[PDB]
Nucleic acid binder design. Structure first.
Ligand SMILES: [Cs+]
Ligand SMILES: [Cs+]
Length: 327
DNA sequence: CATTAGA
DNA sequence: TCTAATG
């Protein structure tokens, strides 16, 4: 957590680079298990050789630990950190729509900067266009003050259209968070579950609603169960307009909400931990259900969930307010 | 780890 | 179809 710091940090810096700037899935994958294992290790690595006794720790990596341990740096790291091409990719990658694959290409073409991208809006697809458009806004954090604002409108129309709907804004927002990166609405309806062969409309309906009023302003992607877009709070009586905000809505069979909701609510750890516990408690938790474990090794048979509660009661725990689902 | 765009 | 990108 801190004794092994520099190492894991450098190591991850190393991994991340193979993956993006190069296409070295493997070397990349390498650096990471290593960085993984060196991280669990309970003592201060004092030398390569020492680390070297680790799994995943080979000669290549080890050699690296030395240099780092020896001098407070690493050339390869100082070399890459410098490298304009590699920088470029690092950068282009921020644009929403742009991944590594695209970034390399863009680069290869000569598009390295923000403006470069403008000059060639043509080479970009819709997503990347939008992302390009809202580069600033996209990067900006969402104040809870605002999330509340948004959550308000969202449950409003949801209700308007159909009153049989159920929305929940999941995420760190759900969990108290002073701010968030984007909004996440989990959606369901009774008329939709496991078998009941869809009703795409159910998603459609709402999307349209939220648009009709000017809340949604772009569409990054719209499927039959997972809308992914951009939104904006009605810029008031002027002098202050609201930044463009990423929003995502998703349809879910009423019969898998709560686990879904639980799950997306986090945190990553609260989850893992609650999850780990259900195991002992003779259960299995995953984003969609909760199955009782059978001794043979495994088992199935989803247990009926009507609320966050059921899942809890199940593994016989303390209902944890989302506020304190921190871990 | 599954859904959506796209070409 | 496969392959990229989000989450
Ligand atoms: Cs080893
Ligand atoms: Cs990106």
């Amino acid at each position: 957590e801190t004794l092994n710091g520099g190492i894991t940090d450098m190591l991850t810096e190393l991994a991340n680079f193979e993956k993006n700037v190069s296409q070295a899935i493997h070397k990349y994958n390498a650096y990471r298990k290593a960085a993984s294992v060196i991280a669990k290790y309970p003592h201060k690595i004092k030398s390569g050789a020492e680390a070297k006794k680790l799994p995943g720790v080979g000669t290549k990596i080890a050699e690296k630990i030395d240099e780092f341990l020896a001098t407070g740096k690493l050339r390869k790291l100082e070399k890459i950190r410098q490298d304009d091409t590699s920088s470029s990719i690092n950068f282009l990658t921020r644009v929403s729509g742009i991944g590594p694959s695209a970034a390399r290409k863009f680069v290869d073409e000569g598009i390295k900067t923000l403006e470069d991208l403008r000059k060639n809006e043509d080479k970009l697809n819709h997503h990347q266009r939008i992302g390009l458009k809202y580069f600033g806004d996209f990067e900006k954090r969402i104040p809870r003050e605002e999330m509340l604002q948004m959550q308000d409108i969202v449950l409003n129309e949801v209700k308007k259209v159909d009153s049989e709907y159920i929305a929940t804004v999941c995420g760190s927002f759900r969990r108290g968070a002073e701010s968030s990166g984007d909004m996440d609405v989990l959606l369901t309806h009774p008329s939709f579950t496991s078998e009941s062969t869809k009703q795409p409309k159910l998603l459609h309906q709402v999307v349209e609603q939220l648009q009709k009023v000017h809340f949604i302003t772009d569409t990054l992607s719209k499927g039959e169960t997972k809308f992914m877009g951009v939104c904006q709070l009605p810029s008031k009586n002027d002098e202050k307009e609201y930044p463009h905000r990423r929003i995502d809505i998703r349809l879910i069979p009423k019969d898998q909400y709560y686990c879904g909701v639980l799950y997306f609510t986090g945190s990553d750890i609260f989850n893992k931990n609650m999850r780990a516990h259900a195991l002992e408690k003779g259960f299995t938790i995953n984003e969609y259900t909760i199955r009782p474990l059978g001794v043979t090794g495994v088992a199935g048979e989803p247990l009926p969930v009507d609320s966050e509660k059921d899942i809890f009661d199940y593994i016989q725990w303390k209902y944890r307010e989302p506020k304190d689902r921190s871990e």
